[PDB]
């Protein structure tokens, strides 16, 4: 392939990472709290409140039920008002989050459920406040799972960036979309396809070895 066009693939890998890792952060920012909110609000737990879980659960179900590009396209006008463009890197992350939050919010609930109920009774037995439970009992026990939840949600976001590249918010997504959909190019399509695959293996592997560090 040509030298200056090779440098375009480098411009994209920057962006595709830039989207996932940023959008992933804001995912957990919004999602990890909603996830813990869901775990605590399960009836028969610390602050049961069954009616709140009926509301918050249905909220994250409807959002997670929406397929991605239908969300992204539907969110365009809000994405415009919130960011101001609706096109490009900054506008890209808002539709990636919010598609990402409910994704992990549910994983955070499930990953936190791996914890035995007995720890929460022991936590209350020792006389800790619900915040002390979540700070130094629930979180650190669920951590090995929450780290996997990162690995899982981060690679899906890479996939979302790709679909998100079609509407022109992204790097490897757009380079893959532009040069394969209209006027297919054997070289560079194979490169962008393999360069994304190796990017997933990198974040997969980095996710495995980081879970080993915190494992049982």
């Amino acid at each position: 392939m040509s030298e200056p066009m090779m440098w375009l693939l480098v411009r994209g890998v920057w962006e595709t990472l830039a989207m996932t890792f940023v959008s992933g952060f804001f995912g957990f920012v919004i999602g990890l709290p909603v996830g813990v909110l869901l775990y605590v609000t399960r009836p028969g737990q610390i602050i049961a409140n069954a009616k709140l879980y009926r509301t918050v659960s249905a909220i994250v179900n409807i959002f997670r039920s929406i397929p991605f590009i239908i969300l992204l396209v539907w969110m365009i006008p809000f994405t415009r008002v919130i960011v101001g463009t609706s096109i490009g890197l900054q506008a890209a992350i808002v539709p990636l989050t919010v598609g990402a939050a409910p994704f992990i919010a549910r994983m955070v609930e499930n990953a936190l459920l791996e914890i035995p109920t007995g720890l929460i009774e022991a936590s209350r037995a020792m006389g800790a406040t619900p915040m002390q439970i979540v700070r130094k009992v629930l979180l650190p026990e669920a951590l090995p799972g929450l780290v996997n939840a990162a690995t899982i949600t981060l690679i899906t976001l890479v996939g979302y960036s790709a679909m998100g590249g079609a509407v022109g918010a992204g790097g490897l997504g757009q380079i893959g979309y532009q040069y394969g959909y209209i006027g297919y190019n054997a070289t560079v399509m194979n490169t962008v396809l393999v360069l994304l695959v190796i990017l997933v293996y990198l974040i997969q592997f980095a996710g495995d070895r980081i879970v080993r560090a915190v494992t049982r």
Binding site: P116, A122, G127
Partner: protein, 344 residues
């Protein structure tokens, strides 16, 4: 008179249906004693124990621990009161993320204990249970006992007055159930700790606790010393879970030799149920020499509680018929149930 329960009643309601776990139950516990509460599977024993620590809030009742009402404490004040009540569970319930040092140190960190005050207290509390050495070993590679030892060390991180064991023996093997129960007792003798128990097994009740209660269908049926409970069964329920739960072997090699009525040149087979006689009473000995009868013990099980013998025995008794009759009667008159189970 350390912990006390007054008219404890509790009901949980799910799916427009109410169920009575506890119905008007009162339990007086003396200071520095081990106290058992046995019952039917989920008969309210599960809930009752945790009403002391207020893990389950009582619908109606009054809980007095160390001469203080717990229900009136609300939120902020109960946090401080639970320092004096440690607890350990059936499954050992501990954080696998932290080591034994950290696991025992955890309840002390809620108090913002400074620096090495936790190092001083943890290392010695860990020495008490038997875990020195393994300060840096994680729960992952600990055995059932080893985990439970951490749990005991953890509950005693506040140097509490009362302790609560929810079926601690359950998951442990017959060998290590010995050690852990003995460790609890060794603490009971040293620190003078008050202890409440609930156990599904009877053998736990015999070895440690002073007073044992029987609770079934959400109400307290019996309350007395272990001595009186195994001796005189009182309720038909307790008698079922005490008498039917102990032995009567009747070996097969003798079974076929057995008869219904007398036999030429024979000896009676009989079993002796001990009803809680006394250890200072030399019954089997006196009976053996005064009546001149050979009481041959074929099979026996008898345990000790509160200064009294109780159990069962299968025994062959030889000697003169004039003697043998009187011999059985002498034991009988001293409270020994004697059935004649055929002849040989």
């Amino acid at each position: 008179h350390m912990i006390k329960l007054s008219n404890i009643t509790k009901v949980f309601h799910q799916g427009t249906r109410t169920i009575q776990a506890l119905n008007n139950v009162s339990l007086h516990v003396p200071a520095g004693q081990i106290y058992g509460v046995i019952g039917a599977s989920g008969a309210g024993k599960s809930t009752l124990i945790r009403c002391v620590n207020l893990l389950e809030r009582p619908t109606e009742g009054s809980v007095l621990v160390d001469g203080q009402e717990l229900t009136t404490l609300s939120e902020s004040e109960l946090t401080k009161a639970r320092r004096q009540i440690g607890m350990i569970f059936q499954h050992f319930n501990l954080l696998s993320s932290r080591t034994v040092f950290g696991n025992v140190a955890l309840p002390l960190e809620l108090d913002n204990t400074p620096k090495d005050e936790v190092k001083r207290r943890v290392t010695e509390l860990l020495s008490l249970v038997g875990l020195g050495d393994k300060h840096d070993s994680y729960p992952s590679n600990l055995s059932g006992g080893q985990k439970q030892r951490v749990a005991i060390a953890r509950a005693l991180a506040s140097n509490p007055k009362v302790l609560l064991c929810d079926q601690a023996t359950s998951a442990l093997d017959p060998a290590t159930t010995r050690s852990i129960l003995e460790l609890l007792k060794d603490i009971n003798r040293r620190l003078g700790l008050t202890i409440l128990l609930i156990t599904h097994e009877m053998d736990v009740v015999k070895r440690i606790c002073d007073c044992v209660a029987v609770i079934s269908n959400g109400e307290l049926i019996e309350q007395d010393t272990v001595s009186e409970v195994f001796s005189h069964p009182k309720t038909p329920l307790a008698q079922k879970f005490i008498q039917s739960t102990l032995h009567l072997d009747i070996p097969e090699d003798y079974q076929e030799r057995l008869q219904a009525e007398p036999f030429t040149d024979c000896v009676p087979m009989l079993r002796l149920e001990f009803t809680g006689q006394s250890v200072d009473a030399p019954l089997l000995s006196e009976t053996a020499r005064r009546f001149n009868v050979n009481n041959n013990i074929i099979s026996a099980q008898m345990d000790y509680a509160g200064g009294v013998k109780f159990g069962i025995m299968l025994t062959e008794m030889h000697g003169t018929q004039q003697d043998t009759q009187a011999a059985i009667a002498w034991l009988q008159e001293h409270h020994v149930k004697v059935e004649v189970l055929g002849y040989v």
